[PDB]
């Protein structure tokens, strides 16, 4: 019953979970072609990634 | 009927769960420890490590529709889950 | 505020926003008929709020009755509906 | 149907839910009052008596 | 007896006890209003 | 000095409007946050009720009394109750006043702040006085009373910080604005046809030369200039508010430095 | 009930303009906007706190007790 | 107990500092100050969870330059900037108040 073990539900061969609500909207703007991030901003964002390896 | 057992040689997810839980129960009951204690105060993690090293002394009796059964040692089985 | 949930200015709450009194009333009867039935509430020997009003009266039958109204202060909490 | 196929149980809690982006999928925030109400009869063993001793 | 009651429909006090019925001596009503406790009440303004 | 430069545009008793330059963004934002949050001041905290024959409920009156502004010049001369070694409260750490009245005439009586009476010893410290900005000096309207009523109570006020709770809020509004012309392109103005006409000009826009369409984007520019306007609640003079906020921020930084030295 | 002591968002005190506000409404027969402007309520976040208030205590006090 | 300092393991000359009862107000100030030091290789912060005033700051610097010393220098710079700000603002307030003595 652990969450990850049901990421892919055998109901329709589709992962039931996904990104929804604001998080989904944010992705489109972020990865958009017209998006650019300034240095100061990046360092803060990088530190949010818990699995960041420490490489710029 | 240990010869020509028609069941798979791999170990089942349900079997994984029950074996792990039972071994954890024994660990909690001051049962014999079979590997080194590496700070894993969690008994369930101890059982996980034991299964990783095939140090669990248990055998499973799988049943068939007709009531017949096969006995498989945990060290025989293949763990890929 | 991902789903329908909401962010509310905390300091605004502290300044009075959506503060609410909440009065509740308890009633009890001293006892049943006087036909050899006895009971009362004279401090016998051995939710959250304050006492606002205590009202004591009697029914048309002469049995004493008591009504207690207590009140409290709701302060908006996370999870409430709006 | 009312007592066997289902039944009132214990060691349970019910309340309202909410969102938390800062929380891992496999995680869930539990109200402190509930954590002080539900329990678990953990068994005393050499590897946990110290922590159990403090908890008691 | 004890200042336990106040005569609803009038500022007057009744201060009655057991076996004193509930009639208001000046109003005749059956309505008693418990005399407010003389102890002080603490609130944290917030 | 070589540090941040200041140029006040307007100055009154209620609000101060000025321009801060030669400073980064983080520092200005920190000044705003601090002036809002960590400005130690005085406020009614404990309310004890003797009698209340009024319409309103006790807790209601206590809550309202919590938010009446109070004089706090010498608040620094006052000590927090959480640190004062006295039980419950003491003059060295708290201010005691009372509120007594009762209906006298058939017309309503408006119980105001000016009816609050200072009791405890102020030791001459300019603190505890209710603040009245009213033209008639009547002060805030605590409550109302009918003829056959009575209200008496005792209030104790302690030094506290708005961060802990709003009632200690010393500063109401902080207008804060920079790069009104949007030279830095920190914003993408939403528009139907053209932002140049669909967006109004900020009053501060007249304090810089309007940007030239023919110049390329200055990608090296810093958000240098800043325009701020602080409206005090009257509890403290506005300049004193700015000074206290600056001091509190510097003191937090100094505390971090002291903790580093102890480390 | 009665005038709240402080504006919920601004924090600007408003529990002192009630009397002069009613005066300007009746004594000077001005509109709400002009009166509020005279009081210095230059933000709608604070103008609201008076403009929308409903004074009930006047009616509670009608009761004799 | 208010502060905790520990060494990072994913890179050298990198440290992680936990500040208790602290938040953006000073954290972003400190980060902005840090990123103006040439010897600093990396500097950022985050807030783990709004419910707690726990502030996490990671900083990596060049060899032979202790990140703790860089933090000390940043603090000193911030203190001096605040002092200069206060002095200038006090003088400006006096000069403008000379006019405000008549207009309050
Ligand atoms: Zn009566
Ligand atoms: Zn004291
Ligand atoms: Zn407002």
Curated annotation (Swiss-Prot), chain B:
Keywords, comma-separated and alphabetical: Cytoplasm, DNA-directed RNA polymerase, Nucleus, Phosphoprotein, Ribosome biogenesis, Transcription
Key word Transferase present: no
Taxonomic lineage: Eukaryota, Fungi, Dikarya, Ascomycota, Saccharomycotina
Biological process terms in GO annotation: nucleolar large rRNA transcription by RNA polymerase I; ribosome biogenesis; RNA-templated transcription; termination of RNA polymerase I transcription; termination of RNA polymerase III transcription; transcription by RNA polymerase I; transcription by RNA polymerase II; transcription by RNA polymerase III
GO cellular component: cytoplasm; nucleoplasm; nucleus; RNA polymerase I complex; RNA polymerase II, core complex; RNA polymerase III complex
Region (Leucine-zipper), start-end ranges: 37-58
Molecular function via GO: DNA binding; DNA-directed RNA polymerase activity
Subunit note: Component of the RNA polymerase I (Pol I), RNA polymerase II (Pol II) and RNA polymerase III (Pol III) complexes. Component of the RNA polymerase I (Pol I) complex consisting of 14 subunits: RPA135, RPA190, RPC40, RPA14, RPB5, RPO26, RPA43, RPB8, RPA12, RPB10, RPC19, RPC10, RPA49 and RPA34. The complex is composed of a horseshoe-shaped core containing ten subunits (RPA135, RPA190, RPB5, RPO26, RPB8, RPB10, RPC10, RPA12, RPC19 and RPC40) where RPA135 and RPA190 form the DNA-binding cleft.
Similarity annotation: Belongs to the archaeal Rpo6/eukaryotic RPB6 RNA polymerase subunit family.
UniProt name for this protein: DNA-directed RNA polymerases I, II, and III subunit RPABC2
Main localisation: cytoplasm
Protein location: Cytoplasm; Nucleus
Function in brief: DNA-dependent RNA polymerases catalyze the transcription of DNA into RNA using the four ribonucleoside triphosphates as substrates. Common component of RNA polymerases I, II and III which synthesize ribosomal RNA precursors, mRNA precursors and many functional non-coding RNAs, and small RNAs, such as 5S rRNA and tRNAs, respectively. Pol II is the central component of the basal RNA polymerase II transcription machinery. RNA polymerases are composed of mobile elements that move relative to each other.
Miscellaneous note of the record: Present with 6090 molecules/cell in log phase SD medium.
Keyword Phosphoprotein: yes
């Amino acid at each position: 019953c652990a969450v990850p073990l049901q990421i892919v539900s055998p109901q329709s061969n589709k992962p039931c979970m996904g990104i929804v609500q604001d998080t989904l909207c944010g992705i489109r703007k972020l990865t958009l072609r017209d998006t650019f991030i300034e240095l100061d901003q990046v360092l803060n964002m990088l530190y949010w990634v818990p699995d960041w390896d420490g490489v710029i | 009927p240990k010869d020509q057992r028609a069941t798979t040689p791999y170990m089942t997810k349900y079997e994984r769960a029950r074996i792990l839980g039972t071994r954890a129960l024994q660990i909690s009951m001051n049962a014999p420890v079979f590997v080194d204690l590496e700070g894993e105060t969690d008994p369930l993690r101890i059982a996980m490590k034991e299964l990783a090293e095939k140090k669990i002394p248990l055998v499973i009796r799988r049943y068939l529709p007709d009531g017949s059964f096969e006995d498989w040692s945990v060290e025989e089985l293949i763990v890929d889950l | 505020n991902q789903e329908d949930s909401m962010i509310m200015n905390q300091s605004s709450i502290d300044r009075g926003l959506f503060r609410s009194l909440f009065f509740r009333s308890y009633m009890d009867q001293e006892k049943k008929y006087g036909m050899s039935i006895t009971e009362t509430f004279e401090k016998p020997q051995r939710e959250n709020g304050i006492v606002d009003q205590v009202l004591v009266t009697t029914n048309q039958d002469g049995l004493k009755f008591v009504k207690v109204r207590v009140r409290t202060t709701k302060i908006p909490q996370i999870g409430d509906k709006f | 149907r009312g007592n066997l196929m289902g039944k009132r149980v214990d060691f349970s809690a019910r309340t309202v839910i909410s969102g938390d982006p800062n929380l891992e999928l496999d995680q869930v925030g539990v109200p402190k009052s509930i954590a002080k109400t539900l329990t678990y009869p953990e068994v005393v063993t050499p590897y946990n008596i110290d922590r159990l001793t403090q908890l008691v | 007896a004890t200042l336990k009651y106040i005569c609803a429909e009038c500022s007057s006090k009744l201060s009655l006890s057991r076996t004193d019925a509930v009639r208001c001596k000046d109003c005749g009503h059956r309505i008693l209003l418990k005399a407010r406790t003389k102890r002080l009440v603490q609130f944290e303004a917030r | 000095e070589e540090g941040p430069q200041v140029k006040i545009r307007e100055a009154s008793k209620d609000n101060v409007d000025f321009i801060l330059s030669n400073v980064d963004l983080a520092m200005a934002n920190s000044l705003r946050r601090v002036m809002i949050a960590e400005i130690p001041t005085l406020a009614i905290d404990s309310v004890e009720v003797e009698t209340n024959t009024t319409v309103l409920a006790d807790e209601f009156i206590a809550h309202r009394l919590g938010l009446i502004p109070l004089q706090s010049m010498d608040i620094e001369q006052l000590e927090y109750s959480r640190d004062c070694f006295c039980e419950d409260h003491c003059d060295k750490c708290s201010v005691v006043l009372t509120l007594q009245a009762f209906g006298e005439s058939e017309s309503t009586t408006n119980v105001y702040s000016k009816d609050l009476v200072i009791v405890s010893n102020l030791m001459g410290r300019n603190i505890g006085h209710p603040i009245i900005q009213d033209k008639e000096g009547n002060g805030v309207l605590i409550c109302k009373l009918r003829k056959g009523q009575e209200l008496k109570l005792t209030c104790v006020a302690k030094k506290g910080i708005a961060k802990e709770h709003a009632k200690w809020g010393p500063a109401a509004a902080i207008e804060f604005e920079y790069d009104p012309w949007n030279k830095l392109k920190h914003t993408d103005y939403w528009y139907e046809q053209d932002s140049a006409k669909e967006w109004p000009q900020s009053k501060n826009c007249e304090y810089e030369d309007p940007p030239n369409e023919g110049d390329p984007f200055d990608y090296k520019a810093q958000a240098d200039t800043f325009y701020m306007n602080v409206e005090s609640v009257g509890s403290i003079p506005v300049d004193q508010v700015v000074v206290r906020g600056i001091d509190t921020l510097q003191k937090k930084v100094a505390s971090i430095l002291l903790a580093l030295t102890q480390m | 009930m009665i005038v709240p002591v402080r504006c919920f968002s601004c924090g600007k005190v408003v529990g002192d303009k009630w009397e002069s506000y009613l005066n300007l409404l009746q004594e000077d027969e001005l509109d709400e906007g002009t009166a509020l402007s005279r009081l210095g309520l230059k933000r709608y976040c604070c103008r609201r706190m008076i403009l929308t208030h409903v004074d009930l205590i006047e009616k509670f006090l009608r009761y004799n007790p | 107990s208010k502060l905790k300092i520990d060494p990072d393991t994913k890179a050298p000359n990198a440290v992680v500092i936990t500040f208790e009862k602290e938040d953006h107000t000073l954290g972003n100030l400190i980060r902005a100050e840090l990123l103006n030091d040439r010897k600093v290789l990396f500097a950022a912060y985050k807030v783990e969870h709004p419910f707690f005033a726990r502030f996490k700051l990671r900083i990596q610097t060049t060899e032979g330059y202790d990140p703790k010393d860089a933090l000390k220098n940043a603090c000193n710079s911030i203190i001096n900037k605040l002092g200069a700000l206060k002095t200038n603002f006090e003088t400006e307030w006096n000069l403008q108040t000379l006019a405000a003595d008549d207009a309050f």
